[PDB]
């Protein structure tokens, strides 16, 4: 028994064909089964023919006879159809409201999540269907991971370099960072974990979490997880106040946090607030300063990634008493300078998935662009807070959507928070970039920030762009542009100072070839998010949707403190770069 995900009406029915088995009311179950392929219905029991070796499961071909379910062919003379009167038969028949249209629910229930349109719907439907969609998508993502073949160590060539044998009649996952494996040793009658791993083309390179002397018949699978049901909204109902509520402003604050005093007061005067922090504008400084402005406030700092949490930890360690901080860790190497798993500590740093059920004066949820609606709901379920602050940048990268192949995901569809920030605007904006030369700031100010982002630094004059398509080769899941690397090679010979540069591209394969040819450290745009370097060399590699995506371009060029070389495939983004043009040697 439970609540219908369309009406809320009490019900004894779940759709057995839906992967999350959502409770549907007599009417909503009916409208769902007759307008889709979903015909298996579950109650206290499953609506299936309780006849011996009858296969009939379709509820519309089934009848209650006695206290058992039968099809047409096996039913007793005294029976009634389970599925008639615009209703499916279960408890609480007399309390059932229905809906005008069941169309959004059916689309969520039946879509394969390969098209942007599925995520648009998941983010504009009713709040109750946002949760259904978020569960459904996530269960679908975890199942897609099982669809991948096992990789088995066929030969150890060296340290860090292997030969894999792949399970026949199942696809191989992409060999990039967005696919994290887990090793396993063959035991008497079982298997035991041996740390997570990632692979890249060579033979394959592997950069595992822990170190080992792994040997033949050792195997690797992407760890999939049980997805729990969601209950809490993606956002609590908003409230505006006429005074700061449940918080006590400090009387003395350092001129280090004085720029955020108005913002800090705004946090205290509504239930939740959104802070758009562009690259290098002081998001973690904001987040910790909030503790100093409200010194008695119990604050839970959360984010999706251990790295995002640890960065809040590093910033805390420098401003907050260490004995008032705790890092929550469940039973990967993260931040180890705070007492571990002390929930009742004033300052709690903890990833979304490991959050305890607790209260707080303020919840700071950082790197919000990377959050899914699933994450947003979990936080609301675990943390009852007086104030929620959502910090991030809808102009930066979202969580990879492993299943999305067709269409682009616009930032207003990344999650409910980014939706608000893109529709009504952010509550608070960090308007001054301290990281980047003015050429980069000016470029992205106009590209994605509506000319509201201001440079601290002057022009560097070390910001260059070259228009060069070169030559694109494709391997199994990546792109390579050797001539764009050649242009970088010739540039470096005439500009040896740039040998301190980081190499960035939209493709792991481009990066692997650049690494060998240039010896620069490499990053994907996606892995560079949150990092900064003095000098950046960027090869666009292709002009795909992937490589021209404005959020990815934005992250790519805002990594640079001093200089950047952009080797561009795309005339559009080339013409938007406010950088000195260089001809081709
Ligand atoms: C058949 C197969 O995929 N194997 C396998 C082994 C260990 C695991 F832990 C997982 C897993 O986490 O899904 C999967
Ligand atoms: Zn269904
Ligand atoms: Zn209903
Ligand atoms: Zn039957």
UniProtKB/Swiss-Prot annotation:
Localization per record: Host endoplasmic reticulum-Golgi intermediate compartment
Binding site for Zn(2+) 11: 4, 7, 25, 28
Top-rank lineage group of the source organism: Viruses
Binding residues annotated for a ribonucleoside 5'-triphosphate, in chain numbering: 277-284
Residues binding Zn(2+) 12: 15, 18, 32, 38
Coiled coil: none
LRR repeats: 223-243
Effect of residue 421 to I: In strain: Kappa/B.1.617.1
Residues engaged in binding Zn(2+) 13: 49, 54, 71, 74
Residue ranges of domain (+)RNA virus helicase C-terminal in the record: 431-585
Ranges of residues in domain (+)RNA virus helicase ATP-binding: 252-430
Reactions the enzyme catalyzes: ATP + H2O = ADP + phosphate + H(+)
Positions of the CV ZBD domain: 1-112
Function as written in the Swiss-Prot or TrEMBL entry: Plays a role in viral RNA synthesis. Multi-functional protein with a zinc-binding domain in N-terminus displaying RNA and DNA duplex-unwinding activities with 5' to 3' polarity. Activity of helicase is dependent on magnesium. Binds to host TBK1 and inhibits TBK1 phosphorylation; the interaction with TBK1 decreases IRF3 phosphorylation, which leads to reduced IFN-beta production.
The protein's assembly and partners: Interacts with nsp8 to form the replication-transcription complex (RTC): nsp12, nsp7, two subunits of nsp8, and up to two subunits of nsp13. Interacts with host TBK1; this interaction inhibits TBK1 phosphorylation and decreases by 75% IRF3 phosphorylation, which leads to reduced IFN-beta production.
Protein name: Helicase nsp13
Stretch of the intact protein here: 5326 to 5917 of 7096
């Amino acid at each position: 028994v439970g609540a219908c995900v369309l009406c809320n009406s009490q019900t004894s029915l779940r759709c057995g064909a839906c992967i999350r088995r959502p409770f549907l009311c007599c009417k909503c179950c009916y409208d769902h089964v007759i307008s889709t392929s979903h015909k298996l219905v579950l109650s206290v029991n499953p609506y299936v023919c309780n006849a011996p070796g009858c296969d009939v499961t379709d509820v519309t071909q089934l009848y209650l006879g006695g206290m058992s379910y039968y099809c047409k062919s096996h039913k007793p003379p005294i029976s009634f159809p389970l599925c008639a009167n615009g209703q499916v038969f279960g408890l609480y028949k007399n309390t059932c409201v229905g809906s005008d249209n069941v169309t959004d629910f059916n689309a969520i229930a039946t879509c394969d999540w390969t098209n942007a349109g599925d995520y648009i719907l998941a983010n504009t439907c009713t709040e109750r269907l946002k949760l259904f969609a978020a569960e459904t998508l996530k269960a679908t993502e975890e199942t897609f991971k099982l669809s991948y073949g096992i990789a088995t160590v066929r030969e150890v060539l060296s340290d860090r370099e292997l030969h894999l044998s792949w399970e026949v009649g199942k696809p191989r996952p992409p060999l990039n960072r967005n696919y994290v494996f887990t090793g396993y040793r063959v035991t008497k009658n079982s298997k035991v974990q041996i740390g997570e791993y990632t692979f890249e083309k060579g033979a394959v390179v592997y950069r595992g979490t822990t170190t080992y002397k792994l040997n033949v018949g050792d195997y690797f699978v992407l760890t999939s997880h049980t997805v729990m049901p969601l209950s809490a909204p993606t956002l609590v109902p908003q409230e505006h106040y006429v005074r700061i509520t449940g918080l006590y402003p400090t009387l003395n604050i350092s001129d280090e946090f004085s720029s955020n005093v108005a913002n800090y007061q705004k946090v205290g005067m509504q239930k939740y607030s959104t802070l758009q922090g562009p690259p290098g504008t002081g998001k973690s400084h904001f987040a910790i300063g909030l503790a100093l402005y409200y010194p008695s406030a119990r604050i839970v700092y959360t984010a999706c990634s251990h790295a995002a949490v640890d960065a809040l930890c590093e910033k805390a360690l420098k401003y907050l008493p260490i004995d008032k901080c705790s890092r929550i860790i469940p039973a990967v190497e993260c931040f180890d300078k705070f007492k571990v798993n002390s929930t009742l500590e004033q300052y709690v740093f903890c990833t979304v998935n490991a959050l305890p059920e607790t209260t707080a004066d303020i919840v700071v949820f950082d790197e919000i662009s990377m959050a899914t609606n699933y994450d947003l709901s979990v936080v609301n379920a675990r943390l009852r807070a007086k104030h929620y602050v959502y910090i991030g940048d809808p102009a930066q990268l979202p969580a990879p959507r492993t299943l999305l192949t067709k269409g682009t995901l616009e930032p207003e569809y990344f999650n409910s928070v980014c939706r608000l920030m893109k529709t009504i605007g952010p509550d608070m904006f960090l308007g001054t970039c301290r990281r980047c030369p003015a050429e980069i700031v000016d470029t992205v100010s106009a590209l994605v920030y509506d000319n509201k982002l201001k440079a601290h630094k002057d022009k560097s004059a070390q910001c260059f762009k070259m228009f060069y398509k070169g030559v694109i080769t494709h391997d199994v899941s990546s792109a390579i542009n050797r001539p764009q690397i050649g242009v970088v090679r010739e540039f470096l010979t005439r500009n040896p100072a740039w040998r301190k540069a980081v190499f960035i591209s939209p493709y792991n394969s481009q990066n692997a070839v650049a690494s060998k040819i240039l010896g620069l450290p490499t990053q994907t745009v996606d892995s560079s998010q949150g990092s900064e370097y003095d000098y950046v060399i960027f090869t666009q590699t292709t002009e795909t949707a992937h490589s021209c995506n404005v959020n990815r371009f934005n992250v790519a060029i805002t990594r640079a403190k001093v200089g950047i070389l952009c080797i561009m495939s795309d005339r559009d983004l080339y013409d938007k770069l406010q950088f000195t043009s260089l001809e081709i040697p």
